[PDB]
Amino acid sequence: VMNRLILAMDLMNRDDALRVTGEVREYIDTVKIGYPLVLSEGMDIIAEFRKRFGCRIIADFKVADIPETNEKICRATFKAGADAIIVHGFPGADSVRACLNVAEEMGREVFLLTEMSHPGAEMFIQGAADEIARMGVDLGVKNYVGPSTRPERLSRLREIIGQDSFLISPGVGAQGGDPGETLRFADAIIVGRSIYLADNPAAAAAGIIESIKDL
Amino acid sequence: VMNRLILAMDLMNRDDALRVTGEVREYIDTVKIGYPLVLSEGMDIIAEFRKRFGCRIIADFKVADIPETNEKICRATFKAGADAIIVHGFPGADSVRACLNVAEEMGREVFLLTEMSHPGAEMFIQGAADEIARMGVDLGVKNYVGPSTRPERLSRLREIIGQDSFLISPGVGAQGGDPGETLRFADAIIVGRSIYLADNPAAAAAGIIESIKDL
């Protein structure tokens, strides 16, 4: 990813989302779009962004349903133009395999979310996260998501998935995570609020990048 | 709910979804709409359904994000007219509380999904489900979702949440669950494919009700 930085575009109205993404485009090549924006402006916003910015789009839908419904969600998401979709591994292997089958059919990618970055992740997800990561490896998953807020857990996740797997990580900035430390284990960092709520989003992105390039 | 039956309307195009829902309307008073229909036709479909059928609408979005994003998803969903939203409990208590706070602000309801109905639920969710249900009780959750495919687990969930809590249950029909046995513990059953893929959806719904009324 350009500059190893992925923008989490979670503003909820089209005009502000387009403005901020355009302001930081020279510093990124990948935008993560989720439900806050899609449920407010429609799935057509994915194709609009992909075209307008010529960026790769990751649909962060944290898919967490039964196999049959996960297939339908993945199919609609790829039909809308997304390059990849983020899927929860907590619901099990069949649910993840349903997503992988659709990505294979459509020439796209699945990112497996192992451990989440917020405090509540410690209650149930953290204890199952190493096993969720191993399950991903056993299913042939090559793209993963792990927590910036717990670099020791990000390290253990990297250990399980190997150096060849691609690992992205949210929780940088607003949630407390550090760009440099996170990039010791992740290939790219996801940043949302630290950039999109900034008085000058481009300056915020530029500052993050400067603290990175020094790695 | 009318006849203790909730329709899971997971068809992906508006015309077929409207046709089937209209054909079975005399047998239900609540429609569960999820991402297969919303991501294909837009969030406006919720208000259209609520108005056209005068039914209560549960948005089955299996919300599974961090607190801040969960708040945004719930706000967009209630703004769209949904009466309730289904939320995963596995991300932890703060993620669930974020949904409860928005529901309180907007005069709506949250349903907490404890254990899922598909096979993969046995891998990680089942082992945490009793605790997820207890967490719900501690947070003051009054509406829950549990699996028709495992009535012994549905019984244990009912035991934890008490008789005053409202419990709905998917996995009836296509996934193997039985209407009557599930209703021994759940207040209402959720049915999707057994009705919407039937040659005559009204006859399928009527047949299910026949079993129910006999209880």
Ligand SMILES: *c1cc(=O)[nH]c(=O)n1[C@@H]1O[C@H](COP(=O)(O)O)[C@@H](O)[C@H]1O
């Ligand atoms: C998903 C999973 C996870 O573990 N942590 C997260 O924060 N997310 C999503 O990533 C974005 C973080 O953005 P920000 O905290 O930098 O504003 C956001 O889209 C969240 O839903």
Ligand SMILES: *c1cc(=O)[nH]c(=O)n1[C@@H]1O[C@H](COP(=O)(O)O)[C@@H](O)[C@H]1O
């Ligand atoms: C959600 C959670 C769960 O544990 N099980 C489920 O099946 N779901 C959703 O409920 C519907 C079941 O429909 P059907 O199997 O009768 O067709 C569906 O919307 C699924 O996503």
